[PDB]
């Protein structure tokens, strides 16, 4: 009911291309745009999409507490919300991943009764998984701010991935336009030596910010981080990835309670699923085409879709309206205000399609766009 | 040099809108598209963007090992790469976050000497941070697969965020079109009781997959997860968020080595930065407008951009070419093949702009698009 809204969106890390379609649609729809980005091509792109943009970066200053900057950034956005404007804040990467003023501005907007939403974006950690060819699932992922990691003595797991953000500004709470020398970097290296040993690999990661750039994926030993010429390479957009040093064994009680053993024993805990983490120290070559793999590939020749497979069975009119709801914030607002009125004014919908949109039920819509074979006789209703 | 390439991209979680601009551009440019997605509107959208698409979901079957499905999915993509095609694989969310066949297919393609890249996307964890209004930085984040969490007895930190994926299929290595009953869910609840206590909150999180849907953000006690009517609500797209139960104190030795104390003591470790995590048990109301905040806001009236602030100073021709490099994979390939030839054939560039593109140096390009004030006299060169 109340006039004014705050939508905070991300740009992703790589210039322009890592922005989501919905982030772009909200930037275009906004009355006012406030942005804080990491390259001028992304800034130029944003200014082509909205006539009313403010750069939040101008609220940093030499020796000015970042906390004071964050308060000001948040207040500039919430002031325009209180005036009844649809405001979009734009932060590079994911706007809620290692960002103070987005969470502050949204909490204030929400607490005062305005519509407030964060749209997720592609973070530096998302880029890290893609560029270093690792999956956080295998074998779990710990993510920390480097100064917080040290000050609160946050635990590491030698059996899981470790990701450290802000390794270029250890112990620095203020700002300088020319960056910092990172004189307390050795305190971080001391902690990594204690946890992992002097010979353990650390990957210096910088995601490409321009589309033609290659990422920095430079493996050093903990010991090599003490060399001044290596330490000096760590800057404002540097992230560290520390791979596991060991594989963790399985718990026999859980194996029993989950009934994972048909009868008795198996080979090993080290018989890895291909591919192996290429950053882990002393990990063996894993065979991609084991006999089991070759047998699975041989079955492709005679493959047919299972009876319970649900083929897409939709229409141009239905795919057009679902695309419009995703890419047009005004259409989505209109639909959310009155499902029936909206549904009945969409041309060329089938009766089922119209009925599904009228209800707004996610399951009805899925059902209208996919063939449900008799065999599927699922429990979606039960 | 070698014919054929594999690019794996994501769709994000929310239908269509959470796809990145670059993911869309690669789907449009591909000779062949292989996809595995979580809603039919996204599937329909992909089929409008490329004439040659294959649904990978048809390679699941009842009682068929997911490992055999993953081998087949990977082989269907690499077969087309070996034939010299530009192949795009599409997985929902981030295609490398809790995905086996993407990493497999890329490692095989890379090992055989083909061009292989993963483009990051918006994961379910990215959605979780946005919808639950938490920052992984505050106070660190542990992310696990629920079965792996139990089988390898992965450590929790009561002082950091915990995120568990695949909580709806504890101990299940195969597949059923109608889903699973999740009969071993109680083994997970037992572990959460041991680590956190019966009264500790667990947030049942499901990101909206359709643009009009609200996310599920349902807080339960560990004890409430034992109620059959609550346990039954956990399905294939369910994630758990477990908030910290305590704030971790600062280490005095690190405080000293980072020189964080001007003279002596301070109030507390609990004087939180606004806003507080709303999911944490028994966390006090934090004041958003402390006297320090009010003073920072009062300074906005007399604010001017600092002398070292670098205003955008570019041209339509330069912003157009940087946008084209981000949104046109063919233009990017042409540019990467011959910087000089490409740069010299861009119309309307200034001499500086042409020179920067000729070099391809990220710093030269940034310099050509931003005004460097004399004051900045930075060390970017030193």
């Amino acid at each position: 009911t109340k006039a004014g809204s705050l939508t905070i969106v991300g740009t992703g890390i790589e210039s322009i291309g890592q922005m989501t379609l919905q982030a772009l649609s909200y930037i275009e729809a906004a009355a006012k745009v406030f942005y804080c980005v990491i390259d001028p091509a992304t800034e130029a792109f944003i200014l082509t999409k909205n006539k009313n943009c403010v750069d939040l970066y101008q609220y940093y200053d030499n020796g000015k507490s970042r906390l004071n900057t964050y308060t000001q950034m948040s207040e500039l956005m919430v002031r325009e919300v209180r005036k009844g404007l649809d405001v979009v804040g734009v932060f590079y990467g994911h706007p809620g991943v290692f960002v103070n003023p987005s969470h502050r501005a949204l909490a204030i907007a929400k607490s005062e009764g305005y519509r407030a939403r964060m749209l997720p974006g592609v973070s530096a950690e998302d880029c890290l998984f893609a560029d270093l060819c690792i999956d956080p699932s295998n074998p779990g992922c710990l993510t920390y701010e480097a100064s917080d990691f040290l000050i609160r003595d946050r635990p590491v797991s030698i059996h899981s991935h470790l990701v450290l953000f802000q390794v270029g500004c250890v112990g620095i709470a203020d700002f300088n336009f020319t960056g910092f020398d990172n004189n307390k970097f050795g305190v971080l290296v001391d902690r990594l030596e204690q946890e992992y040993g002097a010979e353990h690999p650390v990957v210096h990661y910088i995601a490409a910010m321009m589309p033609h750039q290659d990422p920095v994926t430079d493996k050093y030993t903990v010991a090599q981080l003490r060399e001044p010429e290596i330490a000096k390479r760590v800057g404002g957009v540097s992230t560290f990835y520390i791979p596991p040093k060991a594989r963790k064994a399985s718990n026999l009680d859980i194996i029993r309670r989950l009934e994972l053993l048909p009868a008795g024993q198996v080979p090993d805990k080290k018989a890895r699923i291909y591919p192996a983490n290429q950053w882990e120290p002393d990990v063996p070559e894993v065979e991609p085409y084991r006999p089991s793999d070759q047998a699975a590939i041989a079955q492709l020749a005679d493959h047919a879709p299972p009876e319970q497979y649900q083929p897409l069975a939709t229409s141009k009119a239905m795919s057009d309206v679902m695309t419009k709801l995703a890419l047009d914030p005004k259409a989505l607002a209109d639909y959310k205000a009155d499902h029936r009125a909206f549904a009945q004014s969409v041309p060329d919908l089938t009766p089922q399609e119209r009925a599904a949109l009228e209800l707004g039920d996610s399951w009805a819509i899925r059902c209208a766009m996919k063939n449900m074979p008799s065999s599927l006789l699922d429990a979606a209703r039960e | 040099t070698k014919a054929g390439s594999l690019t794996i991209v994501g769709t994000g979680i929310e239908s269509i809108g959470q796809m990145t601009l670059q993911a869309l551009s690669y789907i449009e440019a591909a000779a062949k598209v292989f996809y595995c997605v979580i809603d039919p509107a996204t599937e329909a959208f992909i089929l409008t963007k490329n004439k040659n698409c294959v649904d990978l979901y048809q390679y699941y079957d009842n009682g068929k090992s997911r490992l055999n499905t993953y081998t087949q999915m990977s082989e269907l993509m690499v077969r087309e790469v070996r034939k010299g095609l530009d192949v795009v694989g599409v997985f929902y969310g981030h295609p490398g976050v809790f995905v086996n066949p993407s990493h497999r297919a890329l490692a095989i393609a890379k090992s055989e000497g083909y061009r292989a890249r993963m483009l990051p996307g918006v994961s379910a964890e990215d959605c979780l941070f946005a919808d639950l209004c938490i920052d992984p930085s505050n106070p660190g984040c542990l992310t696990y697969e629920a079965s792996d969490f139990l089988i390898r007895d992965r450590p929790v930190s009561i002082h950091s965020h915990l995120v568990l994926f695949q909580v709806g299929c504890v101990g299940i290595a195969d597949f059923n079109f109608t889903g699973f009953d999740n009969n071993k869910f109680g083994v997970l609840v037992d572990r959460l009781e041991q680590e956190y206590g019966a009264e500790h909150p667990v947030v049942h999180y499901i990101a909206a997959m359709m643009p009009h849907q609200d996310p599920v953000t349902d807080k339960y006690t560990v004890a409430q997860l034992r109620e059959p009517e609550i346990a039954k609500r956990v399905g294939g797209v369910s994630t758990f968020y477990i908030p910290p139960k305590a704030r971790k104190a600062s280490n005095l030795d690190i405080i000293r080595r980072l020189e964080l104390l001007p003279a002596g003591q301070v109030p507390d470790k609990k004087a939180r930065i606004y806003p507080a995590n709303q999911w944490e048990p028994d966390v006090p109301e934090v004041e958003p407008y402390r006297p320090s905040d009010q003073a920072a806001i009062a300074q906005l009236a007399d604010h001017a951009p600092p002398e070292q602030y670098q205003p955008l100073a570019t041209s339509k021709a330069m912003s157009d070419v940087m946008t084209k490099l981000a949104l046109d994979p063919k233009a990017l390939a042409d540019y990467k093949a011959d910087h000089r030839a490409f740069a010299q054939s861009v119309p309307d560039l200034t001499p500086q702009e042409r020179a920067a593109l000729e070099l391809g140096d990220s710093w030269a390009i940034r310099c050509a698009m931003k005004n460097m004030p004399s004051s900045l006299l930075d060390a970017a060169r030193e």
Binding site: R66, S147, Q166, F175, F180, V234, G236 | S137, R366
Partner: peptide
């Protein structure tokens, strides 16, 4: 060269 410097979180406590 360690640029840019766009740090938008910290201190965390």
């Amino acid at each position: 060269n360690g640029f840019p410097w766009v740090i938008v979180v910290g201190p965390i406590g």
